[PDB]
C-alpha cells in the first residue's frame, strides 16, 4: 500500500467523470475538475493488458471427457473420477487464487499511480505552494486558469512566480 488512495487523500471525487485520476483546481475565476489523461491512459492500458493476460494464460486448461466403466471396473472408475475431480479442483484453486492476488495488485497499482501524480506536481511546485497534506497544494501566489493548465500539462515555470510567493511565505 502506497498510502495515497484512502490514505492522505481521504476520499474520491464524484465530480471527476473523465478519468481515474486527476486534478481539482480553485482560483478567483472559479473551480473545476480535469482528468490527467496520460496517467489515466497508462493505467487503463496496463489493466486491460493484465485482464487479457489472465484470460489468455488460462486458455489451455482441462476438459473432463465422459468415460464409462462396468460393475467389475470400479477401481479404474474411481481412479478416473478422482483424476478429473483433482484436475478441476487444481484449476479452480489456480483461478480463484490468481484473481485474488492480481486484484490486490490492481488496487495497489491504482494507489501507486495516485501517489506518483501527487509527487509529480509536488516536484514542480516546491515552496511556491504549501502541502496541506490532504492531497491539495495551497498556492502562495496567483494561479489563474492558464497557470493551472500549466500545472496540469506539466509546464509550470517555477522562476516566474518565485518572488511573490517568496513574500507571503515570510509574511
Partner 1 sequence: DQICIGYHANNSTEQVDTIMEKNVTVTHAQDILEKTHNGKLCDLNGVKPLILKDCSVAGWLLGNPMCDEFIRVPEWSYIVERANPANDLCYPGNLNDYEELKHLLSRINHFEKTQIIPKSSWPNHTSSGVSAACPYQGMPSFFRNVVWLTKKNDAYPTIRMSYNNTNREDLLILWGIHHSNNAEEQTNLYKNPTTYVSVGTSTLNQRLVPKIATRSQVNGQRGRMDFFWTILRPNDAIHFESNGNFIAPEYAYKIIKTGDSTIMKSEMEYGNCNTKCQTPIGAINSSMPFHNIHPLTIGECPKYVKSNKLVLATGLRNN
Give the other-Cβ count within 10 Å of 22's Cβ: 19
- DSSP conformation class of 62: -
Complex with a copy of itself: residue 15 or 86, whichever CB lies closer: 86
The least CB distance from residue 138 to a copy of itself, in Å, is 12
Q: Is 25 in the site for partner 1 (CB under 8 A)?
A: yes
Complex with a copy of itself: residue 31 or 160, whichever CB lies closer: 160
- DSSP conformation class of 153: T
Q: Determine phi and psi for 88, rounding to 5 degrees.
A: -80, -40
Complex with partner 1: residue 62 or 158, whichever CB lies closer: 62
2: partner contacted, choices partner 1, a copy of itself, none (Cβ within 5-8 A by kind): a copy of itself
156: partner contacted, choices partner 1, a copy of itself, none (Cβ within 5-8 A by kind): none
The least CB distance from residue 159 to partner 1, in Å, is 18
* Grid cell at residue 133: 497534506
The least CB distance from residue 92 to partner 1, in Å, is 4
- The interface with partner 1 within residues 74-93 (CB under 8 A) comprises 74-75, 78, 84, 88-89, 91-92
Q: Hey, is 133 helix, strand or coil?
A: coil
Q: Is 30 in the site for partner 1 (CB under 8 A)?
A: no
- Measured distance CA(74)–CA(109) in Å, rounded: 52
Interface characters, 140-169, with partner 1 (x: CB under 8 A): -xxx----x--x------------------
User: Is residue 124 a contact partner of residue 137, using CB atoms and an 8 Å limit?
Assistant: no
Helix axes 74-125, 145-152, angle to 10 degrees: 140
Q: Is 137 in the site for partner 1 (CB under 8 A)?
A: yes
109 exposure class (CB count in 10 Å sphere: 0-12, 13-18, 19+): middle
Amino acid at each position: 500500500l502506497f498510502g495515497a488512495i484512502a490514505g492522505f487523500i481521504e476520499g474520491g471525487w464524484q465530480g471527476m467523470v473523465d478519468g481515474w485520476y486527476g486534478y481539482h483546481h480553485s482560483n478567483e475565476q472559479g473551480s473545476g475538475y480535469a482528468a490527467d489523461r496520460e496517467s489515466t491512459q497508462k493505467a487503463i492500458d496496463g489493466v486491460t493488458n493484465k485482464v487479457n493476460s489472465i484470460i489468455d494464460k488460462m486458455n489451455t486448461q482441462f476438459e473432463a471427457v465422459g468415460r464409462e466403466f462396468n460393475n467389475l471396473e470400479r477401481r479404474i472408475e474411481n481412479l478416473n473420477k478422482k483424476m478429473e475431480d483433482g484436475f478441476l479442483d487444481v484449476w479452480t484453486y489456480n483461478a480463484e487464487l490468481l484473481v485474488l492476488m492480481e486484484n490486490e495488485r490492481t488496487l495497489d497499482f491504482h494507489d501507486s499511480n495516485v501517489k506518483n501524480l501527487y509527487d509529480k506536481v509536488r516536484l514542480q511546485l516546491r515552496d511556491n505552494a504549501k502541502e496541506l497534506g490532504n492531497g491539495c497544494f495551497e498556492f502562495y501566489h496567483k494561479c489563474d486558469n492558464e497557470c493551472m493548465e500549466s500545472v496540469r500539462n506539466g509546464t509550470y515555470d517555477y522562476p516566474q512566480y518565485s518572488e511573490e510567493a517568496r513574500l507571503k511565505r515570510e509574511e
